[PDB]
């Protein structure tokens, strides 16, 4: 129903040069903050209007936390290289994602924290937020180190407390946009390949949030096998786009219906090519 998520990417650079630390924060599908250690004088920066007037202390607090995170990740990246017997000549990637979800009732549903090394699962907090699952023997070292300081309790405290409190404050500050779904604007276009065949492309435009289902049916039967379904993509203005296309014989376009389900629609839509 609603969520706040942070995403960390730490990339070591070979031999000399410290790593590149980038963090972004999201409420649902809206980014609100970015931090890039490569900046001139790097600091947390607003990426959404509803955090811009939070005041300098808020932003000095975030910036200091970001900077300390980047220093931590630099040691972490050296530790990880040692766990896997990796030389300094190579670039490696440490990723972390954590956040909290609210349910339909507006209240805490789950917390999560997940880490990956070179694009593969490394270690994850279990959903009870009280222990970890390690993907390999290296990650079991990390787990033991985190257990030594009993770090699950502070993650739980943050995820079930600070994360939820601040998610609800961001959701209030940005109620005008964050709590208003934008229904997809939908239409069907017609593209001949020959006089005997045409592509029917069903469009969904300007919607929010990103979650959507687009489907072609032929005489009411699901044409999942013959459907070219493009991945949902950002329009660049905070809304999203998707289309689904099917190749039909000429003269039979009316047997084909497109179906779109979305949060901003009170019930699934049904449309067909209108020549």
């Amino acid at each position: 129903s609603h969520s706040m998520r942070y995403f960390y990417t730490a990339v070591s650079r070979p031999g000399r040069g410290e790593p590149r630390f980038i963090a972004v924060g999201y409420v649902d599908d809206t980014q609100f903050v970015r931090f890039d250690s490569d900046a001139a004088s790097p600091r947390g920066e607003p990426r959404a209007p509803w955090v811009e007037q939070e005041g300098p202390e808020y932003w000095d607090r975030e910036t200091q936390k970001y900077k300390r995170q980047a220093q931590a990740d630099r040691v972490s990246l050296r530790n990880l290289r040692g766990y896997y017997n990796q030389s300094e000549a190579g670039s490696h990637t440490l990723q972390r994602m954590y956040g909290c979800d609210l349910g339909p009732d507006g209240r805490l549903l789950r917390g999560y924290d997940q880490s990956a090394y070179d694009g593969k699962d490394y270690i994850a907090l279990n959903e009870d937020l009280r222990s970890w699952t390690a993907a390999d023997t290296a990650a079991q070292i990390t787990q033991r180190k985190w257990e030594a300081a009993r770090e699950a309790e502070q993650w739980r405290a943050y995820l079930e407390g600070t994360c939820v409190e601040w998610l609800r404050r961001y959701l209030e500050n940005g109620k005008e946009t964050l709590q208003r779904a934008e229904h997809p604007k939908t239409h069907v276009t017609h593209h001949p390949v020959s006089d005997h065949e045409a592509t029917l492309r069903c469009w969904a435009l300007g919607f929010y949030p990103a979650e959507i289902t687009l489907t072609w049916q032929r005489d009411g039967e699901d044409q999942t096998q013959d459907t070219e379904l493009v991945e949902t993509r950002p329009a660049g203005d905070g809304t999203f786009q998707k289309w689904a296309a099917v190749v039909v014989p000429s003269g039979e376009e009316q047997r084909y219906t497109c179906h779109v389900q979305h949060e901003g629609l009170p019930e699934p839509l049904t449309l067909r090519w209108e020549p």
């Binding site: 808020y58 975030e62 990880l80 440490l94 300081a149």
Partner: peptide
């Protein structure tokens, strides 16, 4: 806001 980076290195 960010989780305070008092959690440990990997």
């Amino acid at each position: 806001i960010l989780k305070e980076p008092v959690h440990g290195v990997y």
